[PDB]
Design an enzyme around this catalytic site. Structure first.
Site, short mmCIF file in Angstrom:
data_model
loop_
_atom_site.label_atom_id
_atom_site.label_comp_id
_atom_site.label_asym_id
_atom_site.label_seq_id
_atom_site.Cartn_x
_atom_site.Cartn_y
_atom_site.Cartn_z
CD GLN D 146 -3.12 -0.88 2.19
OE1 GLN D 146 -3.45 -1.86 2.84
NE2 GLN D 146 -3.65 0.31 2.39
CG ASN D 480 1.89 -26.59 44.54
OD1 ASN D 480 1.20 -27.59 44.38
ND2 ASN D 480 1.46 -25.54 45.21
C1 F43 Z 1 -3.57 -6.61 1.03
C2 F43 Z 1 -4.78 -5.90 1.60
C3 F43 Z 1 -5.85 -6.95 1.83
C4 F43 Z 1 -5.73 -7.22 3.31
O1 F43 Z 1 -6.11 -8.26 3.86
N1 F43 Z 1 -5.12 -6.22 3.92
C5 F43 Z 1 -4.57 -5.23 2.97
C6 F43 Z 1 -3.12 -4.88 3.30
C7 F43 Z 1 -2.91 -4.59 4.77
C8 F43 Z 1 -1.47 -4.26 5.25
C9 F43 Z 1 -0.69 -3.39 4.24
C10 F43 Z 1 0.80 -3.25 4.57
C11 F43 Z 1 1.64 -3.34 3.33
O2 F43 Z 1 1.42 -2.57 2.38
O3 F43 Z 1 2.56 -4.18 3.32
C12 F43 Z 1 -1.77 -3.63 6.62
C13 F43 Z 1 -0.81 -2.51 7.02
C14 F43 Z 1 -1.89 -4.65 7.78
C15 F43 Z 1 -0.55 -5.31 8.10
N2 F43 Z 1 -0.31 -6.45 7.59
O4 F43 Z 1 0.25 -4.72 8.81
C16 F43 Z 1 -3.15 -3.04 6.33
N3 F43 Z 1 -3.70 -3.43 5.25
NI1 F43 Z 1 -5.24 -2.42 4.27
N4 F43 Z 1 -4.89 -0.73 5.39
C17 F43 Z 1 -5.53 0.47 5.30
C18 F43 Z 1 -6.56 0.80 4.49
C19 F43 Z 1 -6.95 0.02 3.43
C20 F43 Z 1 -7.77 0.53 2.25
C21 F43 Z 1 -6.95 1.56 1.46
C22 F43 Z 1 -7.77 2.27 0.37
C23 F43 Z 1 -6.99 3.34 -0.37
O5 F43 Z 1 -7.61 3.96 -1.25
O6 F43 Z 1 -5.79 3.58 -0.08
C24 F43 Z 1 -8.10 -0.72 1.47
C25 F43 Z 1 -9.54 -1.19 1.73
C26 F43 Z 1 -10.54 -0.24 1.08
O7 F43 Z 1 -10.42 -0.08 -0.16
O8 F43 Z 1 -11.40 0.34 1.80
C27 F43 Z 1 -7.10 -1.69 2.03
C28 F43 Z 1 -6.82 -2.79 1.34
C29 F43 Z 1 -5.88 -3.84 1.75
N5 F43 Z 1 -5.34 -3.96 2.91
C30 F43 Z 1 -5.32 -4.77 0.73
C31 F43 Z 1 -4.23 -4.09 -0.14
C32 F43 Z 1 -4.75 -2.90 -0.97
C33 F43 Z 1 -3.83 -2.55 -2.12
O9 F43 Z 1 -3.53 -3.44 -2.94
O10 F43 Z 1 -3.40 -1.36 -2.21
N6 F43 Z 1 -6.56 -1.26 3.19
C34 F43 Z 1 -7.25 2.08 4.78
O11 F43 Z 1 -8.35 2.39 4.29
C35 F43 Z 1 -6.59 3.09 5.71
C36 F43 Z 1 -5.82 2.41 6.85
C37 F43 Z 1 -4.84 1.45 6.22
C38 F43 Z 1 -4.11 0.56 7.22
C39 F43 Z 1 -2.82 1.13 7.79
C40 F43 Z 1 -3.03 2.18 8.87
O12 F43 Z 1 -4.06 2.15 9.56
O13 F43 Z 1 -2.14 3.04 9.04
C41 F43 Z 1 -3.81 -0.68 6.38
C42 F43 Z 1 -3.80 -1.99 7.19
O1 COM Z 2 -8.75 -5.07 1.69
S1 COM Z 2 -9.28 -5.59 3.01
O2 COM Z 2 -10.60 -4.94 3.17
O3 COM Z 2 -9.35 -7.12 2.91
C1 COM Z 2 -8.27 -5.14 4.40
C2 COM Z 2 -8.34 -3.68 4.72
S2 COM Z 2 -6.97 -3.36 5.78
#
Ligand code: F43
Ligand code: COM
Ligand code: TP7
Ligand code: COM
Ligand code: CA
Ligand code: CA
Ligand code: CA
Ligand code: CA
Ligand code: CA
Ligand code: CA
Ligand code: CA
Ligand code: CA
Ligand code: CA
Ligand code: CA
Ligand code: K
Ligand code: K
Ligand code: K
Ligand code: K
EC number: 2.8.4.1
Lengths: 248, 548, 442, 548, 111
Positions: D146, D480
């Site tokens: 990401q 214990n």
């Molecule tokens: C691989 C996943 C599927 C999954 O199970 N978790 C992921 C990835 C995971 C990783 C990403 C770390 C890395 O890049 O190596 C971490 C940080 C969790 C971890 N393992 O530590 C995380 N997400 Ni995700 N993840 C987030 C989010 C999101 C948003 C991002 C949307 C955008 O437009 O950027 C979308 C879900 C959505 O579309 O609503 C999302 C998807 C996804 N999230 C897609 C990867 C998306 C991609 O290919 O870019 N996360 C968020 O919406 C904000 C918070 C953010 C989290 C980190 C933090 O809180 O600082 C992170 C939370």
């Molecule tokens: O893309 S997923 O909605 O599966 C995880 C968000 S951190």
């Protein structure tokens, strides 16, 4: 079927995307070979990989439900289940995430659709995915500036546009050419370089985007003004509340 | 006046906040960032020293194709990169959790009855003071009866101690004040009299065990450690046999019959003992936060200090580490305590309520829910539409869903004076948001929100509960970010509006009104900023017993 | 009768079997076949004699990758299975010719055990089944080979694993459909902690039978949990009947009409038309080019909607012959039907909510897995009160081999033993016949 | 030759070790002790700074009416006061536990099958190396997919990494050696071949999460944190969709289907998740200790290094803090790893066995138990009788019971090659000791020993288990001191005598054969001495993010 | 209910107080609960008042345990029957009913 309440253009567009009787406007031509390239699951001319034997060869038990439900062709063949994923800009992309998943399960058979804010995905049998993807890429589901085909690194739906009107892409899979006014897909959806880029054509103009969009915004049509759509959402809230308390 | 987030947006971006276009890709990638630059160099040093590759910017995809933003910690003038708000990198955040984990409340009411009714000895303020001197020697890990005991180094355990409180002002004043949480000094008049009437003649200990022990061990250690040294101090101070049948009554009292854990134990799939974050109900979290007793003329400030407390603990430490780990969930939480965004939306909702109903004067009905939650949801979403910089800031749909619904839920509860209709408003907000933008949160964000409306007022076994009693182990809530800390805020909101001294447990409220804590629970967001700046001094470090 | 509702009952080929059966004749509280199924599942144990033998001869006991060098014991258990099984039966039974069974399978490699009902009459719960079975087989094996006192503890480890150092029977070579009582998410949950793959394996992937067994277990749990008491009882009974028992042939006929070319959306359209035809819903008012539907019978609307949900899973996951999309069907069937009608979705949003989490936790890094490893006790899928998991069972029954954690991978021992039992394998005809038997007692 | 404890006794006391009389009361009380003097001063400073009394020598009874003894750490020339062996005061002891708690073993076998059979992609030594480079960036808390991720500071998490091992030498040699635990280098030939044959073509990860995280959180965090970053690294390295159906198979594999926890979760009364000390079976503790692969020509040294490991972890940290707390149980444990006392008794028993039977050549029978355990018990007790200084050193009956029975049990197992008859010898020792001196241990010491004889060979549900599979949650053992670490030694003893490469789990044995650990598991007693001297450098400190 | 002291020791929710004459109407509440707890009329269900209506003895019918895995149906069926009976006795609103649930069964399922 009536699909969705409301009297805005947004509401009508939501109904149109959902309605399998509504013939989606074809905006661009993308060859079968270039769909396969964009998808990035197999090489052109590569026979379909198999996750299991063809249904004729894996001997399913006698079952009235199996007899009544026709498998899609990729299921008959034992194809892998593969995906195509899109990101849609909140700056008036025509399709949007729940619109896609709702529409996909009205229009397409055998579909695993997932909705997220920054990505929306369908998973289905590979050869069927190819046919679905042709439609998703050629029609008004897609605009090459305000939508992106992205299997990873999806950031951008909520970002400001660049000076060309293009959505952000960390991996820059779709490149606007100022000299042609067209977008080229230079990488497949997972971000690997294509030896031969795919012409995605011209982006839609701003007024046409507003005409076709399914997002409500204060600088377009606002949800709060589509009072009949708001009414139904509030109704559902109230009836769910009642039912959970006492359904008698 | 300007919306409260406008300063932050102006600080973060070159463009004015209403502008729809910007520049990408030419920013230098990670090299734009002081903090990423620090991390790249540290990763190289780490790999060189240990002989195994570690942090490397060239792995995976390339960060910083967009602006890597600073964040304003809300209610402060401190701007930091988000990495400085990661709990691993922020000693203030770690100490917030340690100060909760290492705390237990233990009555002396059963204990004093054993002394009087079974041993036949008197209990007086003087005997209590002698007992407290004794237990403040013993509690950090030092001996009072046996010969040839070996003991903890006092400087390593300087953060461990025992205080008491009671609603009886004359008893309280007769005990040495070094050992007393003074309810009259710590709370404004109205709150103090409420709290004293709840406690009455009861006498309660607040026990804090050493941070170094809590870190070595777990939360379930706390009430045990407490009880051992209470037990030894009862033996020493009241001069009974050092281990007779009555000794067992003190053990059972301190470990079970008059103990208040911060958190209750969890079921097997997420197995944990007491005093872990998942066991802390939302009403206790609101009462641990001490904003209520200092910001009592501003219910928004009180409610959003609780949200900050809970978003950090529940999303960053609990869901983001205990229940997952890795990079984790910093920004899912920071959305709720940065850039004065949630503050703007919630002050808007509070004014709408004051104008239309008056605080706590609205009917406690679904009509009120539909009115307020809809109006506040539409205001919040309009801000993302009017200000493209705001939308790029809170770039994840989940972040926006949590922030908008928190304002909607808190505002509804300000109007009704009831947290349950506040909760209904939170769910309605989600539904409206989903239809407005044809998106909401991450893949699994709205499990609890879809179940939500039907379970707000349900009375069935594992469905029905007042919000104050719910917590991270309420079944629908057990998995997902962007809800738990906000629910703690909604729990606080009606009580803040009503002027109530506490939300769910007055002993918990009094127990953190203590200037001898390490973390300052009266100003949670101020402390997060201090930790982000590497200016917070935690307890529990080992420097004294390691090489210089 | 407490309720006036009657249903027509069909077989799994869509043929009418019984007309106008009172709803309560299908109740877990009244229906003797449901009782027999539940009691059967409580008291049945699979014993892996081959697994015990191999664990002993290699000293691989106490869990994954564990071994104690020097402790090996080479015993011909499978070769002497008849004698061992007969000796075990003598200890497991209460009286001769009671309802104890010990039956060898696979040439002595496995045994089916049913512990006598009388032991559970005077038990608080169900753990007597594995514990009585385990010690009977430990003792029978020791006696068969005159295993020494010094070595017998290895036989114990080979049968029941690392228990009691572990809370579970970690590395055991016996298996039950139920799991230990400590693992319940809440009191009353035990019939929910049965893996979907176990149900699918036991019913030999017959879609309607898998749905029926799953619905029986789920809705029976709803009674044990107290959820189907008082105001909610009729809702749960109608759910059982229409979603899991193909009441009025509604599931079957929706699949028939939508199986060749249909989608989730086309099933929705047919279900709404049927609900309107049958008077379950009606137009309450009109907005602009949009009809708002209402109902005076939320429990029956819910049941119709639940039948459509099952049919939609069968059509969507059946067309793919791939189970993964069941999480999507459970979500968007419900999302779509609300905006189609203005009525609440199945379980008043709780199936949709379950589906959101289930989708996430079957397509993400954070937990879960494939559809087959879920169950009603799983934190992801416990939220709907019986209306989601049976669809997951149907979807996994229809999967043609897309899953790594398939029933063949996770549930082979359970399949071998539990599919022998007619009422477990093919519950629907037994529940239908039992309903017919007691119809005049309701 | 002199008994092995004679040097220590001469260092501790003024009198010759056989003398029956000494001087008391005129030794200066606590002022005789450098360490107590340090503590008195520190207590004054602590109280002055915080305004609450703390450590005070004049509370309760007055320490040091007898000699406050130094202790020799066995196998070293280091003498320290007992306080320096308290786990709170000893960073080496804390890091031993952190290094276990923060470790999980996770297969790649199911993962590679998902890649090959479901995704249809190749797995090669090169793809594995690329995956390992990726996961060694990600595991400490850094991003690979990401945009706008915020990350852990690499220097705070420098102790976190992932290595692999396999029995297939040709695969192992094709993976970058920075990431490989080299079985052929770490183990002598015969042990290496045993271990490789156990593992075969399997490929296993050893994952260590950051100490700072383990201390902030709990043991049950470890496998979750591990799985999240494995999951991210699988996505990045094998170039799949970042979250598709197959992603769930990697999650289930890493969290459940091919994970080996160090400890299993505990029941409610002592509720804890995975990777807490109570869940660690005795055979795993023996395999975590790495004495076996370095001291393999001396089975006594191997067994007693395991005893030291377990006595500290199980009595000082687990029973003495997690399950109680306070001053705790330092000397109940030090009895088993100081003054070369247990060493003297156990070398005596080993010689007795060698002369009478030969190692591993005695009948595995009760007659052998009766012979050896009786003889060794009588030797140990005679030493306390012949050397009054020894008896005054191990002044608590429990300490003596544990030491004498450990020597008896280990010796019995040296003879039979079977841990169960060793265990029977331990219980017989207790019974004989009790009758000889008309005392045994503290009030509750012999609960498990009285139940013991009958449960050694029992086959009943919650009774019957080979000793190697037992642990601190075996019902009789759950409460214990003075047993658990000694049982880990008896578990080790027959395997050491047989030359077995492991006791219960070969994967666990290999997983701690790693130079990149912080604590040196090959020399546990040496490390305890280093920590006592305040010379051990632990991981997990916050100095980099706090004021200088 | 009248003190809003629900959810465990020393807990209270200010503003949630409900003053219901439960003991004064115990016969009606018990009879309504019995109708929900029984499986059939005149089965082996008992609901018997003690202490002038301050307490009730409940025996949940055997038939419910015939189709249960364990024993928790007894408190869970009893709890919801009394929650529903109390709500219906006093026409407690949807908005307040969750307090009746908390007063009967406590902090479950958070605990
Ligand atoms: C691989 C996943 C599927 C999954 O199970 N978790 C992921 C990835 C995971 C990783 C990403 C770390 C890395 O890049 O190596 C971490 C940080 C969790 C971890 N393992 O530590 C995380 N997400 Ni995700 N993840 C987030 C989010 C999101 C948003 C991002 C949307 C955008 O437009 O950027 C979308 C879900 C959505 O579309 O609503 C999302 C998807 C996804 N999230 C897609 C990867 C998306 C991609 O290919 O870019 N996360 C968020 O919406 C904000 C918070 C953010 C989290 C980190 C933090 O809180 O600082 C992170 C939370
Ligand atoms: O893309 S997923 O909605 O599966 C995880 C968000 S951190
Ligand atoms: C579902 C369950 O995982 P399992 O299916 O049991 O592997 C559970 N995890 C979680 O709930 C993860 C929550 C934190 C990460 C996602 C935040 S949205 C747990 O580990 O006990
Ligand atoms: O005296 S007791 O045996 O109760 C405790 C010893 S630490
Ligand atoms: Ca600016
Ligand atoms: Ca990178
Ligand atoms: Ca005063
Ligand atoms: Ca006053
Ligand atoms: Ca008939
Ligand atoms: Ca001397
Ligand atoms: Ca003293
Ligand atoms: Ca080889
Ligand atoms: Ca080699
Ligand atoms: Ca070799
Ligand atoms: K094929
Ligand atoms: K007063
Ligand atoms: K290969
Ligand atoms: K800890």
């Amino acid at each position: 079927a009536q699909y969705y309440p409301g009297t805005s253009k947004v509401a009508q567009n939501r109904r149109n995307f959902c309605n399998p009787e509504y013939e989606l406007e074809k905006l661009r031509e993308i060859s079968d070979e270039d769909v396969v390239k964009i998808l990035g699951h197999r090489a052109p001319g590569e026979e379909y990989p198999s996750v299991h034997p063809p249904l004729e060869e894996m001997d399913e038990p006698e079952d009235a439900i199996r007899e009544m439900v026709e498998p899609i062709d990729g299921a008959k063949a034992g194809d892998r289940v593969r995906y195509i994923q899109f990101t849609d800009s909140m700056y008036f992309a025509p399709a949007q995430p729940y619109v896609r998943s709702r529409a996909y399960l009205c229009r397409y058979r055998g579909a695993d659709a997932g909705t997220l804010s920054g990505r929306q995905i369908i998973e289905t049998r590979e050869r069927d995915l190819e046919k679905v993807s042709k439609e998703l890429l050629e029609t008004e589901f897609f605009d090459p500036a305000r939508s992106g085909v992205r299997g990873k690194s999806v950031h951008g739906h909520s970002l400001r546009l660049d000076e060309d009107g293009m959505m952000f892409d960390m991996l820059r899979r779709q490149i606007y050419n100022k000299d042609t006014g067209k977008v080229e897909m230079v990488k497949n959806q997972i971000g690997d370089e294509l030896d031969e880029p795919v012409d995605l054509g011209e982006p839609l103009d701003e007024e046409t985007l507003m005409d076709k969009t399914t997002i409500y915004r204060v600088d377009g049509e606002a949800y709060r003004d589509d009072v009949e759509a708001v009414e139904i959402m509030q109704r559902i809230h109230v009836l769910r509340s009642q039912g959970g308390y006492n359904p008698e | 006046a300007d919306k409260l987030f406008i300063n932050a947006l102006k600080k973060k971006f070159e463009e004015s906040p209403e502008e729809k276009k910007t520049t990408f890709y030419t920013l230098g990638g990670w090299k734009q960032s002081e903090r990423k630059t620090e991390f790249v160099n540290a990763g190289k040093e780490v790999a060189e020293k240990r002989g195994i590759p570690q942090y490397n910017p060239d792995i995976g995809t390339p960060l910083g194709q967009r602006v890597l933003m600073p964040y304003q910690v809300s209610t402060t003038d401190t701007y930091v990169e988000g990495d400085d708000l990661h709990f691993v990198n922020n000693a203030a955040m770690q100490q917030l959790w340690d100060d909760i984990r290492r705390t237990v409340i233990v009555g002396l009411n059963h204990a004093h009855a054993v002394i009087e009714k079974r041993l036949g000895k008197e209990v007086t303020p003087e005997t209590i003071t002698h007992y407290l001197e004794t237990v403040n020697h013993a509690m950090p890990g030092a001996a009072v009866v046996q010969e040839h005991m070996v003991e903890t180094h006092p400087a390593l355990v300087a953060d461990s101690y025992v205080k008491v409180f009671t609603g009886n002002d004359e008893i309280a004043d007769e005990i040495d004040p070094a050992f007393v949480i003074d309810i009259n000094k710590q709370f404004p008049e109205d709150q103090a009299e409420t709290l004293k009437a709840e406690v009455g003649d009861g006498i309660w200990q607040v026990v804090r065990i050493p941070t170094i022990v809590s870190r070595t061990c777990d939360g379930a250690t706390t009430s045990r450690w407490s009880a051992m040294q209470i037990g030894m101090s009862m033996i020493s101070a009241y001069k009974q046999a050092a281990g007779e049948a009555a000794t067992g009554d003190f053990a059972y009292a301190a470990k079970h019959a008059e103990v208040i854990h911060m958190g209750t134990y969890l079921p097997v799939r997420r197995a944990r003992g007491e005093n872990e974050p998942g066991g802390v109900p939302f009403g206790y979290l609101a009462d641990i936060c001490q904003s209520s007793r200092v910001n009592y003329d501003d219910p928004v400030r009180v409610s959003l200090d609780v949200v900050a407390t809970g978003a950090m603990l529940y999303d960053q430490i609990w869901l983001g580490s205990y229940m997952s780990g890795g990079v984790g969930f910093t920004q899912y939480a920071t959305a709720a305590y940065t850039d004065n965004i949630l503050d703007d939306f919630t002050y808007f909702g509070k004014e709408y309520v004051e104008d239309k109903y008056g605080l706590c004067e609205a009917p406690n009905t679904m009509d009120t829910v539909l009115d307020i939650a809809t109006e506040v949801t539409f205001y919040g979403l309009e801000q993302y539409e009017e200000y493209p910089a705001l939308l790029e800031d809170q770039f994840g749909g989940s972040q926006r869903a949590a922030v908008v619904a928190a304002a909607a839920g808190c505002s509804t509860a300000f109007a009704t004076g009831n947290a349950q209709t506040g909760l209904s408003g939170w769910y309605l907000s989600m539904y409206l948001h989903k239809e407005q933008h044809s998106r909401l949160g991450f893949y699994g964000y709205d499990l609890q929100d879809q179940c939500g409306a039907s379970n707000v007022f349900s009375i069935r076994g594992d469905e029905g509960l007042p919000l104050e009693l719910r917590g991270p182990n309420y079944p629908n809530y057990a998995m997902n970010v962007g809800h738990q800390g906000e629910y703690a805020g909604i729990s606080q909101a009606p009580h803040a509006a009503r002027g109530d001294a506490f939300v769910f447990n007055p002993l918990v409220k009094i127990a953190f009104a203590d200037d001898n804590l390490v973390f300052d629970f009266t100003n949670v967001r101020g402390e997060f900023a201090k930790g982000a700046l590497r200016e917070f001094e935690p307890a529990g470090e080992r420097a004294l017993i390691t090489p210089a | 009768a407490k309720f006036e509702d009657k249903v027509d009952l069909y077989d799994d080929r869509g043929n009418l079997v019984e007309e106008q059966v009172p709803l309560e004749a299908l109740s877990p509280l009244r229906n003797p076949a449901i009782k027999s199924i539940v009691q059967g599942i409580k008291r049945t144990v699979a014993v892996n004699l081959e697994g015990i033998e191999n664990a002993l001869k290699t000293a691989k006991v106490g869990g994954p990758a564990c071994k104690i060098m020097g402790r090996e014991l080479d015993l011909d258990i499978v070769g002497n299975a008849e004698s061992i099984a007969a000796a075990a039966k003598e200890m497991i039974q209460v009286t001769e010719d009671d309802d104890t069974k010990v039956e060898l399978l696979g040439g002595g490699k496995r045994a089916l055990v049913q512990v006598p009902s009388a032991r559970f009459d005077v038990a608080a719960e169900y753990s007597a089944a594995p514990l009585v079975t385990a010690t009977a087989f430990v003792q029978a094996i020791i006696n068969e080979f005159d295993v020494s006192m010094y070595d017998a503890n290895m036989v114990k480890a080979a049968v029941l694993g690392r228990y009691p150092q572990s809370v579970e029977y970690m590395g055991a070579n016996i298996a039950t459909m139920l799991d230990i009582p400590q693992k319940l998410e809440g009191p009353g949950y035990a019939l929910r902690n049965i893996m979907v793959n176990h149900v699918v394996a036991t019913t030999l992937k017959n879609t309607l039978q898998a749905a029926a067994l799953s619905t029986i277990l789920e809705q029976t749990a709803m009674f044990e949990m107290g959820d189907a008491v008082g105001a909610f009882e009729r809702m749960h009974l109608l759910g059982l009947a229409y979603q899991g028992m193909n009441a009025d042939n509604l599931v079957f006929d929706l699949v028939k009409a939508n199986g060749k070319e249909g989608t989730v959306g086309s099933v929705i359209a047919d279900l709404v038309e049927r609900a309107l035809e049958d008077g379950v819903i009606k137009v309450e008012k009109e907005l602009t080019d949009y009809k708002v539907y209402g109902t005076d019978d939320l429990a029956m609307w819910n049941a119709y909607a639940a039948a459509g949900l099952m049919a939609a899973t069968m059509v969507n996951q059946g067309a793919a012959r791939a189970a993964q999309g069941v999480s999507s069907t459970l979500l968007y069937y419900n999302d779509l039907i609300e905006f189609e009608t203005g009525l609440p979705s199945v379980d008043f949003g709780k199936v949709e909510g379950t589906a959101v989490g289930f989708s996430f936790f079957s397509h993400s890094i954070y937990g879960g897995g494939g559809p087959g490893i879920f169950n009603g006790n799983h934190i992801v899928t416990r939220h709907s009160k019986g209306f989601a998991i049976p669809c997951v069972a149907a979807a996994m029954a229809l999967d043609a081999g897309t899953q790594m954690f398939s029933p063949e991978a996770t549930s082979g021992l359970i399949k071998e033993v539990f599919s022998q039992v007619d009422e477990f394998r093919e519950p629907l005809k037994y529940v239908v016949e039992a309903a017919a038997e007691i119809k005049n007692e309701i």
